Design a binder for this molecule. Structure first.
Ligand SMILES: Nc1nc2c(ncn2[C@@H]2O[C@H](COP(=O)(O)OP(=O)(O)O)[C@@H](O)[C@H]2O)c(=O)[nH]1
Ligand SMILES: Nc1nc2c(ncn2[C@@H]2O[C@H](COP(=O)(O)OP(=O)(O)O)[C@@H](O)[C@H]2O)c(=O)[nH]1
Ligand SMILES: Nc1nc2c(ncn2[C@@H]2O[C@H](COP(=O)(O)OP(=O)(O)O)[C@@H](O)[C@H]2O)c(=O)[nH]1
Ligand code: ALF
Ligand code: ALF
Ligand code: ALF
Ligand SMILES: [Ca+2]
Ligand SMILES: [Ca+2]
Ligand SMILES: [Ca+2]
Ligand SMILES: [Ca+2]
Ligand SMILES: [Ca+2]
Ligand SMILES: [Ca+2]
Ligand SMILES: [Ca+2]
Lengths: 69, 418, 421, 418
DNA sequence: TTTTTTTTTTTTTT
């Protein structure tokens, strides 16, 4: 009765984006924000894509700037 | 406010050619933290000598005034170094620091207006002028700049501009098949739409070195390849589909297969896709191999994005949009095959006009170029000169309109020059 | 300690109980909210409420009105209304005191909007340009029927002035129209590949180069690079095919060198973002006019503009709305707006394929909203062989300045150029 | 709960009053009413006496009427001579009895309807015997709430009430422009809607002494006044536009300005108002100067009261209601300009019908009177007899339906009689 | 409820 999820793996994806961030390309080809289980990750991965559409590009700074926006 | 501040200062200790963009964008006062103010000042102060700007010279400059202890230690300057994602985009942290600066400047002048509202109750009109003036205190491309890019572009013109179709007369009129164009090829059923598109795909994939993606929504990948084999090798299609091949046919086939292998043509025969799906697949193929053309066997077969199964004219109106936008985004010609309404048949002159394009007029409107196929022998059983087929170029906003003639040897699934 | 002439407030209310023809100037100058004291607000409201019957306004009827709502006890007694009567001896210069009450009203309105700007500074740290715009706009807003005597004067003084008119450089059209007038919405509609953009670009050039005015072009279909290349060809008579190949004759480069020269000091601002809302267009123009002054706005292709949120509404309404917004933009910036439009295929069905107003694609409100509707028709667009090729009709199907009619021009397509005859 | 049989015994008094004042006012009064139409027992008897005396004919004044009432047992029953005296002082003039008589009559019809409806329901429970004939009586009994020229009536033998528009033929058919009416003037774009409205406004504001409020949501006040100047003085609009005026044009303008000054026409060109706003403004102008007409430059341009952006047909359905109700409240004709849907341009005959009114059918249904403008020369470039314009009066519950012809000299922004 | 754009079966327009 606990929904299939894999938070560890969710974090690993978001992590890699802050590390690379050319890693956002494969990530978004494979996932949309809603695929993430944790409400918070949903919002973060959305912001990441939102910033990419400018494109800024995507690092730990620009992402928090977009999340505070 | 902060952290973007650190990212800027950080990048300077990392680069330090990053100080140039930084200072073009910011003055020391733009920083919120008292300490950063002083540091960024010192950075510019040392640059004016110019030293230039590194973790040493900066702390030397900060100690030269009473300030090195005030800003945290050398240990705070050390942290700044370690606190930036990528040296390369200072521009984007600087612009955060700058935007925050503007915000509090706004807040500060707005509060001082309100402040003055209670005090100087003396002369209303000049107070309202001050408010106007105190609150004031390009997104268009400038033509000077475009002219240069348009010049330099005409310059890159030693040595078709143009992905070449291999049909001389059409290429003369069109010069490719240009990046970002939507090319509509429409004609009545069984006239030769697919045949024509496939022939273009081959000559592009084999004669040039570019990759071409074909989305077939009606025929299978198998049937497509079999049409290209016949056309590549001049093997009679009936023979080929029976296996009833002459001894020299087997030669022709062996050759045909050879050249089509190094051809690099990517075929997707999923019978129902949305444009989004098409886009996704192409985006990825261009990612890892580079794309040159997209061919779609057939626009009104594509299926809508959710808007509920809307006024069908709108549904395709939208698909039309999406395709042009896809061609624009991938900087690649997109050939979309189209059907025609029966209207054309009711006529005397069975040559199609733009109005005839089936299901939505927006297709005429969106296209960069509209090609009709007309075959006299399609209507006349006896027709004099059979294999001739008009390529009516009814629309193009590159240039010229007009008709071109080719031969469509049907037995070979092949279009040929004259 | 908010700004309030609670002395002058009484003087106004007083004068009304004394006159009471004094309520007329008073109300022309003030609304109830202008009064600082909660009580006066209510009283002056009641005064107007009674006037709308009209009773008219005296110490009796007013207290009758105030008691008719829960309010007579809230404002002091009848004894307070009695004091108001006695506060000022005579009721002559109410105009004076009313204008004090009004001026104080404006002051706190200013203070209130300034504080709420500062307030919003900390909160909506999200979108900087649209925020700074609000401050600009909110501070101007701190500035019923127009009397005809007054308008007549402005109009006479205006006629005292003597193309009126931003001139297109097409003589016969300019005679018929005289510009291209400030605040007009000009619709240019015609079938695909007939010459819409070509025509609009030609007008933009002749305005930007012949006059000294700036012109903004929003291209939602073509790139800036393609637009400029059209203008180059038209400015210098360089064959477009040659130009896009780089296959230029020795004299062509000469032609290009001058074309580039004149188009530099031309001052034409091009925005080729493929999806904008009208609001966005407005914002950009507002700003360009701010710092450089604007003369014309050209929009390649109205139905390509996208809607403001109302959900993906009955599409006819969505464009109905875009239409209104554009006219209202032209009105606000005091500048002619030329919107290109498509046409439905209905015309194709017809015998003669000259368009009528009904043909404008997607919503009938466009005919309605337009100050002026221009159709382009080419005989050679339908006849392959057509006698006199380069001729093109500019059918002026609608204008509420004046005359309706057809004008003829030549459209040398090889040069992306419209010319006079 | 408390159900009060509908009546207006203010309006009743106003009718009887006007008769003692005029008394040629008894003619319209009796064409419209029989004694039984009056609710108050007393008025019934008085108005009966009035007619009784007219049949002699005496004629009808305060004396003869009391003589007739005393001649039957009735003079004491109806209040005294002192009540008959009050009736006289009811109205300032015997102006527009026609108006108040029609209120009394309309109320009479309402309760006749209510009464026959309740008696149908009544009979529903009782005569459960013969279903089909019960349905016939219901049919027939509901028609009889409404009350074909005979050959003899047609042998009268071979061989303005009313704000006056100044167009003779229209005024004959209409007689004003009546207090409390909603008048819809609709026509295709650029046909002459505003022109016609403005022309009416001038002739009212200059020829009569009444004030007129014009709400222009599309054109500026400036453009409106310039249209009127041209029409008042016969100055060519193009000339006036340009300032390119002949020496006599200046004379014509000097004049036109003169007369338009003392004209008293109040113009509100705020591009977005709600009906509530319109009401508010007019209520106030009537307060201090008196109002005669309201013109609105266009109904579907007005904007909705909050109900959320509702089924747009309902949104205008509502605006429509509000306007009629405003006309009713201010006791003043309201001319609302309307657009028409494109469906007319399909027909081989381009004369509008009521259905064509754009956006909501309730407009037909709320209007007291619907006028269409039709121009042959709008459609025919060459049209024989150009300046002619039909004023199709498609609806009016005063009386006659029909078409009227005027000339619309466009160069002068002017409508003229023929 | 309405306004708009499309395809394709009927009748009747001198
Ligand atoms: N005679 C002959 N004709 C063929 C053969 N194979 C294909 N074709 C012709 O080529 C045409 C193919 O048309 P196609 O391009 O697929 O139709 P479209 O996609 O609707 O335009 C058909 O009308 C056939 O007449 C064959 O084996 N023999
Ligand atoms: N003959 C010729 N025509 C051209 C050339 N370049 C552009 N055109 C024509 O100019 C026209 C462009 O019209 P346009 O205004 O862009 O289309 P619209 O915006 O939908 O009306 C088309 O009819 C083209 O065929 C050229 O080199 N030669
Ligand atoms: N010849 C000529 N006609 C004009 C002039 N000014 C206006 N008109 C015409 O008179 C009409 C007035 O506009 P109008 O019908 O009131 O707009 P509406 O609200 O859509 O009906 C338009 O049809 C204009 O063509 C002018 O100066 N000269
Ligand atoms: F018959 Al087809 F495209 F294959 F119309
Ligand atoms: F050619 Al178009 F809108 F039809 F630019
Ligand atoms: F042209 Al309009 F109302 F101004 F129909
Ligand atoms: Ca096919
Ligand atoms: Ca265009
Ligand atoms: Ca017109
Ligand atoms: Ca109008
Ligand atoms: Ca209703
Ligand atoms: Ca209808
Ligand atoms: Ca009525």
């Amino acid at each position: 009765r606990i929904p299939p999820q894999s938070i560890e793996a969710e974090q690993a994806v978001l992590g890699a984006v802050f590390l690379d961030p050319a890693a956002l390309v494969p990530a978004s080809e494979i996932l949309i924000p809603e695929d993430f289980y944790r409400a918070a990750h949903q919002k973060i991965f959305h912001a990441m894509l939102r910033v990419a559409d400018r494109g800024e590009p995507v690092d730990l700074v620009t992402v928090t700037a977009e999340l505070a926006a | 406010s902060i952290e973007a501040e650190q990212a800027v200062l950080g990048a300077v200790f990392l680069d330090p050619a990053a100080l140039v963009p930084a200072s073009e964008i910011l003055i020391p006062e733009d920083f919120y933290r008292a300490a950063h103010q002083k540091i960024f000042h010192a950075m510019l102060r040392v640059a004016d000598r110019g030293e230039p700007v590194d973790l040493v010279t900066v702390t030397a400059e900060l100690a030269a005034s009473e300030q090195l202890e005030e800003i945290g230690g050398v240990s705070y300057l050390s942290e700044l170094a370690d606190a930036v994602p990528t040296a390369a985009n200072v521009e984007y942290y600087a612009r955060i620091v700058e935007e925050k600066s503007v915000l509090r400047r706004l807040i500060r002048t707005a509060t001082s207006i309100a402040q003055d509202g209670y005090t100087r109750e003396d002369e209303i009109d000049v107070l309202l002028d001050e408010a106007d003036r105190k609150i004031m205190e390009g997104a268009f491309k400038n033509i000077k700049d475009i002219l240069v890019q348009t010049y330099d572009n005409i310059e890159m013109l030693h040595n078709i501009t143009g992905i070449p179709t291999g049909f001389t007369e059409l290429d003369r009129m069109t010069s490719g098949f240009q990046r970002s164009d939507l090319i509509i090829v429409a004609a009545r059923p069984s006239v030769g739409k697919t045949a024509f598109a496939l022939n273009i795909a081959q000559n592009v994939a084999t004669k040039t070195n570019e990759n071409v993606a074909i989305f077939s929504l009606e025929m299978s990948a198998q049937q497509l390849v079999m049409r290209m084999l016949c056309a590549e090798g001049n093997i009679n299609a009936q023979n080929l589909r029976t296996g009833k091949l002459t001894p020299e046919d087997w030669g022709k086939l062996t050759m045909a297969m050879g050249s089509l292998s190094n051809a690099g043509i990517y075929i997707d025969d999923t019978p129902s896709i949305r444009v989004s799906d098409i886009r996704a697949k192409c985006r990825r193929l261009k990612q890892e191999s580079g794309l040159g053309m997209i061919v779609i066997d057939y626009l009104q077969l594509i299926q809508g994005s959710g808007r509920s199964k809307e006024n069908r004219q709108q549904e395709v109106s939208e698909i039309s949009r999406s395709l042009k936008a896809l061609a624009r985004e991938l900087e690649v010609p997109v050939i979309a095959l189209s059907q025609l309404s029966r209207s054309v048949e009711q006529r005397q002159d069975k040559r199609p006009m733009m109005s005839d394009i089936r299901e939505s007029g927006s297709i005429e409107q969106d296209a960069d170029i509209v090609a009709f196929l007309y075959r006299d022998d399609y209507y006349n059983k006896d027709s004099e000169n059979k294999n001739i087929i008009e390529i009516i170029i009814a629309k193009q906003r590159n240039g010229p309109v007009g008709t071109v003639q080719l031969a469509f040897i049907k037995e070979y699934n092949k279009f040929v020059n004259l």
